[PDB]
Symmetry: D3
Subunit: 276 residues, 6 copies
């Protein structure tokens, strides 16, 4: 009931002739949150590990030692966490801290044991986890949804009306590379990251969830800015966006997504704004 | 100048590995309205001819005989016309009839002379024209935008809020195969054909009246499981084979004229 | 015992690298007349429907309404029919009309029911049928073999010596689109369409039959005149020739074929002859 | 104006996706007989050398030593010759023997000098030449059109009616590997040949200027065709069928070699 | 005359049908040391930057701020340096340190200015440079060739006879992810890393130089252990080895190479060496 | 239990995009010597037949008549033989002649019956056999390992130190086309045919055997000099090298190989040397 799959990096040239089924296998995590299970992807775009943890009966922990060539999961890595599901808790080295819906956590490198548990097994917590390599330990921090700063953005004419939530951000805190945020599109607005960009020096992974209706789908565009493809996403699915690719998506209704960013810098304005 | 370019039909399998540059060449007409010229595409998806006529100083007529193996353009064909530009007139066999903005016209099989004129050379008429093969002559008809029937459709939740305008429609008139309509998405809505594949008919969409110059429309095609997209600037058109779905999304609101033909005038409802 | 398959149209570039098995699947109908069955093809080259209704005794009907988005098969289409087999019958709106060998029939737009029957189950009828979309009803007409003008053509030096028979022809009849003909090569001549002639404004389907002996084969050439491929045809097989392709064939012996043409014009002089090079 | 081109062999699998121009480049010799010239192709299907020599003003000899890794052309090879044009002669080591139209010749391994001449420069001899590697010297022999045993075959119903002329045939004579013959379809017949061995066909004597021959090659299930003008040649590897059909009648010289005679 | 070219990562599948010119373009840095120039590759295999700095007349420095989206080259990165050419010096923030032949250097995250100079313009220093992303400052260290620690290895029977030189090694020093070493093959031995290893969690870049005679070539094998390709190497050229690929080489004669390693761990035991079945 | 597989010729272009699995299928005979069996490959590069005959319980003969379109195997062909295994014998038309380890034999065109036997069932002879088309009968000849015609070649710096043994050679003997030799690399040298050559008028097949250790591997390079590939070999495997391809190999240890050559000439200097630039 634990799975971690490996995905290789590619050039723009390599994917040019991929069909939709090949694009989907290569860039799309089709199953993230499943009850009782840990589902993870390891991408060779900056060695990000991401997935979800949905504990029910037994408490769930990510135990990786020999698999990463290390003594314990976070020995050389750091970790972001956001709970998009029901009420639950994570205990960090024995200190149990409760996490409600949309509560975040940062866990710095060197932290040896993090255990994921849910309060009500029939409405469990869904922990979206993103781990990146780390050379420096920074203090663990809880990012409450309560104290999270909501910023409305976008207008109705451009169909981008949304609320942006800072979670793991170099302005509020210090991390090695990982950055994470939360974006809720208002009803009647489906476009995300519409003015698009390719930041060569970092990559992003988007995970789309909280779909308005079970019938909504999101079309995520990726690819070189002149050559764009799209992947159609159902609820609680994610797509990896390499450094050379634009990352944007359009919905049939409103939805929400978590983006995770990493690379060799945290500076937000290094991107090249994009004609496609 | 006059231009008519030819485009072949394809299988879904044939297009599966096309890169963006080849899809664009194959399914996308990138220049439709240019001043003084008539620009046309002939697609082997049901032999539709479509394009634009922008007369300014010299009246423009589509002169086709030997190219179509026929004595004059409309001997075996019918013709739709919609004016998306300035005020103008079409003279049908010497009879000049004025066409205001968004005025439509249908011209049945057998009409030997259609010449396009514009009122103001500096605000010319832009005539979007669609011709399909026709075996029966039906009366020519003027379709004023004034008397056209607007139908409100869509909500804000699904971002499809729009007004539907029937122009050449089998309920309002009789044509062999050709059908044409006009759809204006209200501000805050970019989705068109929010539902599909009609295996028994094909469609060509021409997008125009972009709200802002920065607007772009992403039109999806392909069988529903393997979908590709072409990104469109203002005043461009894309052909939808019978086997492909019809979708488009703008970054803002926009308008498009659809033109349909096929084996009937009467559709089955991704990745 | 009724079958209709769909086949998509293509560009020349699309087929340039097709292998031989792909060419056969895309352009070739491998079975037309089968006992008890009706087999049909729908080509996206001008939406021609062609095939055969090869009964045993009483039932055969083409049930197409919703599949074509219409109330009945011929509401928006017309239909040509040739009997290449034994004596049989088609019933038009309840009116049963018997068909001898090589008798033709045309049925205009709007005719609501046609049912195919044969007398002897052991000497059955083979009905070759071609339907194209139609916007105008035209009179049904009988194409008798007795009064069918035989037109001799070709010499032995060019191995094209043959008899040409007009059936559905714009000089003798009125149709929306469809045209059909019948050609019997004399023994010692197998070549058909000696200059190749691509006509951009219409397409053709060739159905080859009446092979001299069971071992004969016909090689049907297609493709742009510079890049030509060929499909090897057994008896009672058909090949779709898109507007952009030459249509040629040579047999190892004599044979016969029905050609069916449709498109946006009926003009026979609108073609580009391909001079003898390839 | 001496030419020899190299062409590699292939598997059936290799050609499956060749376009028309590629098959022609790989399997089709487009110019064989040009006045005054020798034109040759070296194919890696059994290292057959074939082409034509059309002497006009100057006598012509195929001079190959270093390129074939030998001291003279025929040191390790043998040579067949058929003259499809006007009267001529070959002087073999100074001994001149006249070659009329459709005269044959075999020249065994070890013969150092073959010189091709024609009487009239304005209706020259056309020498179609085929050479195969040879391990044993056999006598040089003239193969007259008269004494070349003709075998009639085919009927009009099958449009294959022709007379087959054996020239170099293991029944009348001995060679290392090479076998060569001459086949003329009668008027109103265009079909030809409706193996340890390969074949090279050179089609000529087209009835009318518009005649074309479609030569089929490939495995029996996957067949292609090449379109042939007059005086052109096509190689058929061991794994390929050998077929052709013309728009009129014509002639061809076949040359075969391989692991059996 | 500063160059940094970008090279993308690939799947094993992606390269399977690469022809010889394509393999070279994707995996081979063909020119590293040229007089007066800085030549660099940025590879999306763990974002390693490598190349050479060969100063002659004018002092040379790697100046990157906006291109990497940072304030200075080393703000988020660390830097290894080994001088394979003549005597020269690197001045770190104005503080000049001399660099003799085969002298090494490590420069930790945060040092703002490193300037490479050569003593004699006609026999310049050839500085091989390797930079990896770095989150933690560690002390700069000079690694003199004099005090380097050699380990002889291999026999003549396996043609692997060689001497190994520790330069940037977690035993002598602490770095974020970079590791670097130097290996000189004895005459009569051309094989490097012969029993071949994959380690999924780290990648390697090899730069081969000091070829015994001008005619020698090195054949570097890469690819999955079942599907292996090779690139043919002249003197002073380098090859990038993805985490999924083996690292091998054979010369027609002896030679030397510098290896540079990084990844998400520094543990050398993490690799799983493939038993000898290849292709 | 007789096998002969057929392999077609190719152009350089044809193989340029072959993957590893395809090259092996086209150019590599993976099993040659198996107890009790005849294993053979027919290549359309000059129609060479090669393989192995390992008699144990019953006598073995190569019976090919109608398959090659002849009455008996050698009617149009000649045959080279070298025994790399245990003690054995070939009986030529009833005349039994013994063959020890590394004993050779040439058998000319027209010999109707060649029968292979082994002395000890459990230490069988491994007869490596090579047949080429032949138009002329030449005398059968036994080629004892005793009279070796041995000769050392190469130096230690180039790792080619080796012994060359002439077997079927046009200076000592007369054959139609076939030429065969045996080359033993001394321990501490693995390179064969290192200065590499391509001869349009001849092709070669290498069969590698006597690997020093069970883990030894040989990397055989083939292809046009600019576009080169390689196949990695176990012990007792063979590789076909078309006229347009280089012939090279490197071992992880020493080994031996038997080369067999044919073509339209026997000239040993008709070849093109490859200057060391090969991509
Ligand atoms: Zn981004
Ligand atoms: Zn539609
Ligand atoms: Zn035609
Ligand atoms: Zn043959
Ligand atoms: Zn390594
Ligand atoms: Zn050689």
């Amino acid at each position: 009931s634990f799975s971690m799959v490996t995905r290789y990096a590619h050039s723009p040239e390599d994917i040019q002739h991929y069909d939709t089924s090949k694009l989907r296998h290569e860039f799309l995590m089709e199953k993230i949150f499943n009850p009782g299970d840990i589902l993870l992807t390891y991408t060779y775009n900056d060695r990000m590990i991401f997935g979800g943890v949905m504990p029910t009966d037994e408490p769930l922990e990510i135990k990786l030692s020999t698999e990463l060539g290390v003594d314990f999961f976070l020995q050389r890595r750091e970790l972001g966490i956001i709970n998009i599901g029901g009420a639950g808790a994570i205990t960090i080295d024995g200190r149990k801290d409760a996490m409600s819906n949309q509560d975040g956590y940062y866990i710095g490198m060197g932290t040896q044991k993090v255990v994921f548990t849910s309060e009500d097994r029939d409405h469990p917590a869904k922990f979206y986890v993103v781990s990146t390599p780390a050379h420096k330990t920074y203090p663990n921090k809880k990012l409450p949804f309560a104290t999270a700063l909501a910023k409305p953005m976008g207008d109705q004419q451009h169909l981008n009306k949304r609320t942006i939530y800072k979670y793991i951000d170099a302005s509020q805190m210090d991390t090695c590379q990982l950055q994470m945020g939360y974006t809720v599109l208002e009803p009647g607005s489906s476009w995300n990251t519409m003015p698009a960009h390719t930041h060569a020096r970092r990559m992003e992974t988007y995970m789309y969830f909280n779909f308005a209706d079970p019938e909504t789908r999101v079309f995520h565009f990726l690819g070189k800015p002149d050559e764009t493809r799209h992947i159609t996403l159902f609820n609680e699915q994610a797509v990896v966006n390499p450094s050379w690719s634009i990352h944007c998506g359009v919905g049939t209704t409103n939805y929400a997504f978590i983006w995770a960013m990493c690379g060799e810098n945290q500076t937000y304005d290094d991107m090249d704004q994009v004609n496609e």
